[PDB]
Each structure stands twice: as structure tokens, then as C-alpha cells.
């Protein structure tokens, strides 16, 4: 039993919780900065959450437990002067130039600087930013002129992936964040999943920009620029246009893309149906051959890097079907010329992804054929929003349009790919039809859905029982492997997503400030858009996609053999033995 006084208001409570959490639950404003994911920066507390506790003095609300008898003041002059001072000291290490900054519209530090009217003691104005910037990665970029040393990226990497690939380092006698030994992230165990970017309150961590690749292609007279968006983009991008959360903006995106000058509007959900054709065909082959097992998905490039970096002995069990991004891109340089008359060399294929790891996937050396890359550029959901705003397109006011259908139609199975368990559910819908040679009516697999970290299910296919698992976040992959769960039974098909929640929570998604994250379950709300589409779509199985059926009939032949196997697949292998 506890009685506490906050700003003169008495509260009676039995809760055991921090001052910050209690205050937020009771509509009392306390500021915070380094607190995120239930953790603050223990070795360098920001102290933005400072409050006064009578008899004790100034304390950090984000990590101090309420106790019976506490009398708390959150808004005294002494408290506010301390907070202002901490913000001023951060400005002393921050290049405060918001005009061209990519977080200008949604920066948590700027909000605090305005709120406390803080100013640097000395403006931080480095003349040469070269030593502060790291753009070596295909996926991530670091600008340490903006870094507050808040630790949010370090903590988020450990929580989300358990790789600890993001670290505090000593560089030239100064503390920075970066990769192991200050190497390029891509050359370390890093997954390039971008959860560190999602955790950053400022513009210090960003995606590696592909915006100039795209602009130059749009402006080249002879290039025919295809664009296709991932499942999750249509459930997410509206957030950056003050539209709120959970808004389906599929048709507005198609219109915006035409206004930006793209030459063909397709959809990666078509590629998702392609991946299902190959992946369900492979699963059925393995079922009819009673092996090999388990089969892992290979469509999340964060998981592919996790397997390469930590479980190379599993690479032979990964599916060889290309991911929807790469399988679509392969078809865009082969099938698409065959139905359009375009010279393949002049097609430039752009995807819009909720993902930074997809930029590494698209840039893998062997993701090409006959000199033509499968995918020429990958922009994130955030990059597309900036492109729209730079062009002055009034996004929230646009009318709906449709995709071009030849590589644009999608079934409901493809639409759900962006949520954890979506690939599994989509694959089972086709595998059961294929193996049983039937058109089954019961197609919903709710047991694989939702935010649990490890989700197992038993499925009956062709009068035998099989075991499936959906691994939801890279940290949960480690738990599943390290605890021996992989050996507790025979698994037959396993989905792995590196980002908890699936691609709707990817590393290229709009930032959400900590207060909105408490108010809204972003992973569930974004996913609900995708499940709503599947419910209302006429075709809810990938192999019922009419444009896809035409494409295989006229160009690829049978899935899993012949031309389809030759060009639509990509096999991972552990490295050849060498010493040292
Ligand atoms: S990170 Fe925030 S405060 Fe710093 S320059 Fe960019 S918008 Fe301004
Ligand atoms: S990209 Fe993912 S694995 Fe790499 S440092 Fe960031 S959070 Fe960690
Ligand atoms: S990169 Fe961003 S999240 Fe990481 S310590 Fe710097 S400001 Fe904080
Ligand atoms: S879960 Fe999706 S967004 Fe996250 S790394 Fe994998 S493909 Fe990228
Ligand atoms: S928010 Fe409490 S110490 Fe940083
Ligand atoms: Mg702490
Ligand atoms: Mg053009």
C-alpha cells in the first residue's frame, strides 16, 4: 500500500512501478529521451526525466520506483533548469541544422529543444563532417554529428536481435556507437535489419540512400522505370502524412507513384504470389519425397544473414525460391520485356520496402543474369515519403488508382506477407491444395498469426500430420536454436522473420515516437490493414492469381522445374573450406 503526492495531487496505489510510468498512466507530463524499450542508458543517463523527490532531491523518473510517502514535483524551477542544462549540453555536441535534416518533421530532440528553449553554450559546427559519417554499408548510414550517445540503438539491437552488433566503441579517445572494431556493418555479424535506426531519436542512424539512383533513372530518356511496393508500405506510409495509424493507402500510393514519373506501376505482392508458387511446390516435393526436413523460408534477408553468420549448417535447408523482391525483379527483366517489347537493358526496376536489409539483398553479386540486375534500386517507406513531399504531391488528397495488372494483381495470400506468420499461412493455402489435388475451402490459419515470439502448429496435409513453426524476430531464432527447441520434435517447414511483428515493423518504416508507441500497438495495427485486404479479396490463394497463371502458362512453364527452377531460384551455400 502506497500514498504518493505528485504536483500536490495525492494518489493511493498498490502498483510497483517507476515514477515515469505512473505519471504517464495518470496524465502527468514528464519528459524523457534515452528511455526506450523499458531501458535507459545506464552508463550515461540523459536525465531528461528528472523530477524532485522531497527528502531525496533530484532523481531520474524513468528508473526510480515509487515508494510510500514520496512527495514529487515535476515542474519546479530547479527541475526545469536541470533539464534545460542537460539539453544545452547535448546541443554542445550536436550539429543543429534542421533545415536539410531527414528527421526535421519528427525529431524527438528538436521537440525537447523547443519545449525547454535550450541553447548550446557553444554551437557545434564541425568544418569537415567526413570523419563523423560512415556510408560504407549497403543498408545503414551513420552521422555522428547528430548522435546524442543515448544508447537506444545499442539497447534495441541487443533486445531485437541478440547479436549486439551495435556497440559503444572508443575512437580516437572519444565514445561513439558503431559496429565491431569500427568495421563496416556489412562485414560483421550485423543482420542489416535496421532496428537500431527505428530506435534512434535523431538523424544519426539512417538508411543508405537510393534516392539518387531512382531520380537519375526517372530522368534518363531511354530508361523505363518500374516501381513495385512491398505488402507493408500500404499499411504504413500514411503515418508520415498526418493520416494516423492503420490507414490503407494502397490506391493513393499508386497515384503518387504515377505523379512522380514512374513508367509502370506493379506490386511486390505479385512477387509474393510467385514465391508461394515455388515455395509450396518445393514443400510438396519434400512431403512426397519424405525429406529433406526442415525447410526454412529464405525470403527475409535479415534471417538469411543470421543463418550465414551464425548457422551456416542450416543454409542447405533454406528454400531456394527467390524472395518476392528478387523473384519479381528477375521476371521484370525477362517476362516483362516478352509482353511489352522493351529492351531488357532499358528496364530499371525499383522496389519500395519497409526494410533496410533488402538493399543488401538487391546488391548481392549473383542477383542478376546476362548483366541485368534483378533489382536496380530499393527505397524505404521513409525515402518514398520524402520523394512525395519534395515533389509537393498532396498525398492525403489524392484519388485512388490501380496498379498495372500484368505484374500487379495479387491474391489475399500475398497481401498478408508483411505480418509475422503471413508467409506460412500463404504457403499452407497452396501446399494443401497442391498435395491433395483439391480446392479446399478452409484457408485461415489463425494459430500462426500474432505477436508471440515462437508459434508452432500441427497441420494435416494429404492425410499425414506435419509440424510447422513461425519464428517472430531474430532474438527468437536464437532462443529456438540455443535452447534445443529445434530438436524437441521433427519440424518440416519453418518461417523466420528478423523483425518482431514481421515486415510491418521493419527497419525502413516510419519512426513512431515513444508516447505513440505506448498508445498504439503499431505491429498489430499495421498488420490489420493486410489481413483486412485478404478477407475482402476474391482470390485468396496465390495460385489463383490470374496474371500469375498467365505468366507461368505463357513464359515459365511448371513451377519448381525447367525454366522456373533455372531463373527464379537462388541457392545459399556455406563457404568452401579454407585455412586460415
Ligand atoms: S537531428 Fe533533430 S535537432 Fe538535430 S538537426 Fe536533425 S531535426 Fe534538428
Ligand atoms: S541492423 Fe539490426 S543487427 Fe545490425 S546493428 Fe542494427 S539492430 Fe543490430
Ligand atoms: S545513433 Fe541514435 S540511438 Fe544510437 S546513441 Fe546515437 S542518437 Fe542514440
Ligand atoms: S522481417 Fe521484413 S523488414 Fe525485417 S529484415 Fe526481414 S524482410 Fe526486412
Ligand atoms: S530518460 Fe531517464 S535517464 Fe534518460
Ligand atoms: Mg536503467
Ligand atoms: Mg523517365
Residue numbers in the entry: 1 to 580
What do the paper's sentences say?
pmcHydrogenases are metalloenzymes that catalyze the interconversion between protons (H+), electrons (e−) and hydrogen (H2). Their catalytic cofactor, termed H‐cluster, consists of a [4Fe4S] sub‐cluster ([4Fe]H) and a diiron moiety ([2Fe]H) bridged through a cysteine residue. The amine base is connected to the protein surface through a conserved proton transfer pathway (PTP) for rapid H+ shuttling.
The refined occupancies indicate that the OCS is fully occupied by an extrinsic ligand in CN−‐treated CpI, whereas only 71 to 93 % of the OCS of CO‐treated crystals hold an extrinsic ligand. The electron densities of E282 revealed varying conformations. The structural changes in PTP elements observed in our CN−‐treated crystals have been proposed to be necessary for efficient catalytic H+ transport, but they have never been observed structurally in wild type [FeFe]‐hydrogenases.
